[PDB]
Amino acid sequence: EVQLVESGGGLVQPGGSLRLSCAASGFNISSSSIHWVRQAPGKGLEWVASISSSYGYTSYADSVKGRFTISADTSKNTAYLQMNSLRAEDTAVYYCARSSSVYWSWWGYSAFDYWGQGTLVTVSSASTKGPSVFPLAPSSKSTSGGTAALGCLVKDYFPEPVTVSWNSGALTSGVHTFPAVLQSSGLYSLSSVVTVPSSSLGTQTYICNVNHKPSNTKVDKKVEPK
Amino acid sequence: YSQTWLASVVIIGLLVGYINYQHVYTLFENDKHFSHLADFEREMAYRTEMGLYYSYYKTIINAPSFLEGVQEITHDTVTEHGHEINTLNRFNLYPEVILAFLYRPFRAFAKSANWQIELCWQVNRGELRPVESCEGIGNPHYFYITGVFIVAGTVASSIFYLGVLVSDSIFGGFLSVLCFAFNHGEATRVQWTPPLRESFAFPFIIGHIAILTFVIKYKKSGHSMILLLTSMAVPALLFWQFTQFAFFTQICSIFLAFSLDLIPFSTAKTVIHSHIISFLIGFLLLFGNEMMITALYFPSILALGMIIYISPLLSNLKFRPAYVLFLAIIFASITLGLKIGLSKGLGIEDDAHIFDILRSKFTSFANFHTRLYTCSAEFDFIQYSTIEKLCGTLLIPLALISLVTFVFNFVKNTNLLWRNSEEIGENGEILYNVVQLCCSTVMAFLIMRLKLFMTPHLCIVAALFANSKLLGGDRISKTIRVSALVGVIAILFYRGIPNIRQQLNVKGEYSNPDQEMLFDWIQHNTKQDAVFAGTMPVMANVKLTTLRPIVNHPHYEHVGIRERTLKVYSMFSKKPIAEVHKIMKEMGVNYFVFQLMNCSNERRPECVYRGMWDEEDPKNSGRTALCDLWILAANSKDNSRIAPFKIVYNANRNYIVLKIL
Amino acid sequence: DIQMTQSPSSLSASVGDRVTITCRASQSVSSAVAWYQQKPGKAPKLLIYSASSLYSGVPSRFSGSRSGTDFTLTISSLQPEDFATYYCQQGASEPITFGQGTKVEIKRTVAAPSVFIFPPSDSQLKSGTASVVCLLNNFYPREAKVQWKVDNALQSGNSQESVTEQDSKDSTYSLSSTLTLSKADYEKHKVYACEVTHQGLSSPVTKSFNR
Amino acid sequence: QVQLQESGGGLVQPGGSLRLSCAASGRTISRYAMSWFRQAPGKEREFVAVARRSGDGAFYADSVQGRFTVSRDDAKNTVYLQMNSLKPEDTAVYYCAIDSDTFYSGSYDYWGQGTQVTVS
Ligand SMILES: CC(C)=CCC/C(C)=C/CC/C(C)=C/CC/C(C)=C\CC[C@H](C)CCOP(=O)(O)O[C@@H]1O[C@H](CO)[C@@H](O)[C@H](O)[C@@H]1O
DSSP states (O other): OOEEEEEOOEEEOTTOEEEEEEEEESSOTTSSEEEEEEEOTTSOEEEEEEEETTTTEEEEOTTTTTTEEEEEETTTTEEEEEEESOOSTTOEEEEEEEEOOSTTOSSSOOOOOEEOOOEEEEEOSSOOBOOEEEEEOOOTTSSTTSOEEEEEEEEEEBSSOOEEEEGGGTOOTTEEEOOOEEOTTSOEEEEEEEEEOSTGGGGOOEEEEEEETTTTEEEEEEEOOO | OTTHHHHHHHHHHHHHHHHHHHHHHHHHHHHHOGGGOOHHHHHHHSOTTHHHHHHHHHHHHHSSSHHHHHHHHHTBOSSSTTSOBOSHHHHTOHHHHHHHHHHHHHHHHHHHHTOOOEEEEEEOOSSSOOEEEEEETTSHHHHHHHHHHHHHTTHHHHHHHHHHHHHSSHHHHHHHHHHHHHTSTTTOOTTTOTTSSHHHHHHHHHHHHHHHHHHHHTTOOSHHHHHHHHHHHHHHHHSOTTHHHHHHHHHHHHHHHHTTTOSOHHHHHHHHHHHHHHHHHHHHHTTTOTTTTTSSHHHHHHHHHHHHHTSGGGTTOOBHHHHHHHHHHHHHHHHHHHHHHIIIIIIOOOOOHHHHHHHHHHSOOOOHHHHHHHTTSSSSOOOHHHHHHHHHTTSHHHHHHHHHHHHHHHHHTSOSSBOOTTSOOSOHHHHHHHHHHHHHHHHHHHSTTTHHHHHHHHHHHHGGGGOSSSSOOSSSOHHHHHHHHHHHHHHHHHHHHHHHHHHHSOOOOOOOHHHHHHHHHHHHHSOTTOOEEEOHHHHHHHHHTTOOOBSOOSOOOSTTTHHHHHHHHGGGSSOOHHHHHHHHHHHTOOEEEEEGGGGOOOOSTTSSHHHHHHHSOGGGTTSOOHHHHHHHHHHHTOOSSSSSEEEEEEETTTEEEEEEO | OOOEEESOSEEEEOTTOOEEEEEEESSOOOSOEEEEEEOTTSOOEEEEETTTEEOTTSOTTEEEEEETTEEEEEESSOOTTOOSEEEEEEOSSSSOOOOOOEEEEEOOOBOOOEEEEEOOOGGGGTSSEEEEEEEEEEEOSSOOOEEEESSSOOOOSOEEEEEOOOOTTTOOEEEEEEEEEEHHHHTSOSEEEEEEEETTEEEEEEEEEEO | OOEEEEOOOSOBOTTOOEEEEEEEESSOSSSSOEEEEEEOSSSOSEEEEEEOSSSSOEEEBGGGTTTEEEEEETTTTEEEEEEOSOOTTOOEEEEEEEESOTTOSOOEEEOOSOEEEOBO
16 A cells, blocks of 8 residues: 655754655655655644655755755655754654645645654754653642652653653552653753652652663662651 | 926927937938939939839829829729729828828918918039929928828837836936937938838837836726727738737737736736727728738737636636646647638638748748848848947847846746736736847847847837846945946947947938939830839839839739739740740730849849749750840840840940830 | 644634634635644644545544635534644645644643642752752643742743643643752752742742742 | 722522623723632632633633633623522622733732622
8 A cells, every 4th residue: 555654864963964765655656746844842844845756856945945955766766855964953753745746736736645654853962871860759848648749850861762660650640751851951851740649658668760771771769758 | 206207207208209300300311312302303212112102192192182092092003004903901001191181281271371381492403404402391202201200200209218117217218218329220210211111100019019018017907098009009000011910929928928927817908908909990991901810910819818818717726837838838729720720711821921031041942032032131130240239339238237137036036836826926017028029139130120129129128227126126225326327328428429420420322313314215205104014123213203004013022913023024034035025015014124233143143133043944044044135235236136125225324125016 | 935824723622512723824825725633643644635625534524614815624523533733734835834733632620730849859969950840730721830939039041841741531731840050059048939820720829948 | 900890799599590790991801811710718719710812712610610601792891600500509709800911821910899699
């Protein structure tokens, strides 16, 4: 069946270059146009570039004009985007979409009916490092004997994938994880807070285990009531 | 200031028009000296077809009444002996009819009122008999010439106004009329040749262009604009038949603007309705001429009207190249199909001479008619001397700079691939005039003589250098823009003053006595109903003065006379005497007048009668050329070898008159 | 060069309720508009093309309309799986422009936020800087507010905000505010306050602690 | 610069319905939001309902869901509340509160005299 598959993403130092591929299975390319679309983290969709391979027509977004080059070869039924001088604002998920050929546009392009699965590209001059975990015990002056919340804060880790669990996941009620936030120094910081029950927070020293596959870190911190 | 600008523009337009009229009239006086010529010597001054066109004016004014004179013109039986022809729609004698109509009542009123509009005195020519040369408005020649020059003095006004429109500042109008003034010699020739048809028609053509640019620029429409466009499209069509092919290259320019979304719907509808109405009136007034149809001007009107009316059905089209290509295909297909559906269809057989002399320029196809027209030095390619002269005054470099500026601006301020049908692209008159200049330039480069169209558009485009929107904007500042617009004007005067000097320091020759003596012999020793045949240049002069019926004239393209010219010029071929005598007797002529240098072979070969009569008469090749017989008969003063022909007239071995037995 | 503007930047409705999202084009793209929906973490999927023509295979409860340059997407019988972000596209020019987006969430009764304040841990005093956190849980609707001040001191450019997606159980929200100060500035006034203003709470809730 | 006046009042009875209105003078309502609060002994400063600008969606408190309806008129610049199936545990003072924040953060400063009602 017809499908688009993206590959070639990853991590690039700012100002570097990256070439990412879109392979089409099923429909033969050069019978249609293919476009690239950007989803920046937390933003909307943005259009990047377009190529019609029959007679080699390419179009670019004024933002990326002069930095990106879209080129398709019908031999392997693939399209390539070569993007150079990547800035820090080019970190995003890139999608490959299929539309009608420009020569048969005639009343405008058709809607993008088939999309790729998306490839993530991150432009960051920072290196990769393990996270630092700190505890957070409930204040003794508030919610004394009532609602009790215990937290674990993870800071200065890279890259994004980092999983926080409590007592090997046995605790699931009132456990909330917050999306990581990228701050000035270039490292992410998030938190995991669990609404501990009453009765002196269960008189149990909870364990927060943080797993970071890129750094292969399995730090387990112990949090106990103040 | 909103009104002081308009008043100044109008006043300057009128003043430049008057100055141009005075300049042409002065150049004409210097060239010919009508001041001290007898009324029969000015007629001799009018050369080959200028004499054919003025003789009908003379016929109408001399006739007992306007109606009887016009009836004699429409039922003319002496221009082409053997047929009754309509010379009004055949030669386009509407200027002569109008001028004669105005002259007869004017002279009648002046004579009775005791007004002395004509004053003249005896002038002594010396050896020849003294004559009487008359001057004043009441003189027929000055009435005709004043009409022609009054009409042709408004070309300067039209060019000034077009410069002001296409640039939107007076400095542009000044640039355009100053480019016209310094290239006056290469832009017009009315000062030598008043009676020619283009002298009457071109002013109206360029006035129509001006009104069209005004209508396009301001998005005008309505019935008033239709009246304005028709009042200039009708007279230009009644005068100069080739007006039509001008108005076809105008339509091809409007289409190419409409297809770029630069002209609204209602404005385009006004334009095409005015064209339709003007064509209907011009076809009616020209006695249903069949050459009107099967031209490219009727099919063009219909094709453009169809494209304009199927425009709203194509609103949803967004890809501009497809839209432009579809409209172009429709336009070209309709024009070609309609033209061939009447020429080759209903059986109108439009003359194919214009395509016959174009296919000879690039191909080896010769034909007698093409060599007769191509070797004229006036239907040849534009000479490099003209290009060098136009580049010398800086009219081509300036126009080229303006054209490049316009193209860069147009490309950088438009969406080339994608079109919106709800918005008008702006700057439509400038693109109309640029495309007009590019159709005028190709015509002028192929057939010289058609630079009367080329040069005034070069001036109008050069006026585009004063457009603040182009070549800058609000960043240039007023002081800098004005400072560089007087520098250009000062460098135009530097290289343009000598042109005016060399144009005002030229004087013409004092005719030749041979033709007058020949006409004296014709008048004294020939009966009033004799029929003359000879070379085309001399026939129109024999008809204008001596009032003799003739069998061939210089305006020969129309059917039934394109075949008499080959019979007439067979005398210069290698046919036997018997063949030529039978031909001449069958045509019913009595005398054959020609010149001894017509039979003089080298010049450029295949551009002399001897060479021409060897490419389409190979059977007769190897026979003694008839011209040798003529020269020996003239020298020996005996009608021995030429059996039935007599050398009735032979003076100073220039003009020879043979008599048909 | 042509901008698409979606009106309801955030829409909240429950199952079985009619929903309408509107898109406005500055220019006059005739009918080349399309509507997509995206669920978090997955690529978009075409719903409507040409502003009226339902794409094959999608549920028939979606409808499109056009009037002038105002385009409309309508959902009649809202269902649990119809909770995503809806995007508007124009394809009548070269720079293909999308819409800013619309998010449709689950409507529910207003819930009073619960706030807590936590100071830096023991290890925060050895790294040279420490971070204070304000945790808010179980509040509706989406929009809220959190403020940081030390001894009635304004703040700007130092607060880090994290917001979680709508809870799948009670359809609530949680926020976390972080304020980090260096050791040199950590030894300042020992009293730190955290104020939160919520539409469901007329009086802002303030939590203070001593250093 | 602005003020709010609440109509209604009187002694309500079980099984009845309430038709109250709050009128704003000196300021508009379409630009800003509008909220409805209750003040009662033991549990006061309790949120009741909120409407934002025109009817794009109104939020009701958990304990007041299904018995409150709120509408707004710009021409009269008023907010009308309709209540049905009154219960004896609604004895309090109603306040029609206007926020000074355009972002809907809940910046309420003016309360007004409200309308005090008791059951039984
Ligand atoms: C691509 C672009 C961007 C532009 C240009 C493309 C284009 C439109 C091209 C083609 C132009 C063209 C070569 C046209 C026809 C001109 C012609 C070949 C012949 C008529 C000669 C004069 C102009 C009138 C002559 O007519 P006129 O009334 O002035 O005088 C009498 O013409 C009779 C013969 O036509 C004679 O029988 C008689 O002796 C007189 O000479």
